């Protein structure tokens, strides 16, 4: 069975958004790495000037 | 015998123109001290400046 917000698509479709899904989830989860790195990074300056 | 820039000094003229002499090389001592120290904590912070 089709297991989507959208629902109703078959064939080819249903393979393209299924690609779509994909896709989202890939950038999000990019985007919540960059919010990560940037906030450690932010630690670490901490650090360099405390250790000053 | 006496020896010293001045000369000419006996007994207890002496014995205080030695102790001032000494006084005044501890001084220059102290104030080399200070210089060498103060130029290598310019070094220490070229150092933490580099590291970060």
Chains 1, 2 share one sequence.
């Not at 629902?7 to 994909?22: I, P, Q």
């Not at 999000?28 to 960059?34: F, I, M, N, V, Y």
Request: aromatic share 0%; charged share 40%; proline share 2%.
């Amino acid at each position: 069975p089709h297991l989507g917000e959208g629902g109703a698509l078959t064939g080819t479709a249903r393979k393209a958004e299924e690609a779509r899904l994909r896709r989202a989830e890939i950038e999000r989860q990019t985007e919540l790495g960059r919010l990560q790195q940037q906030i450690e990074q932010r630690r670490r300056r901490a650090r360099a000037q405390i250790e000053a």
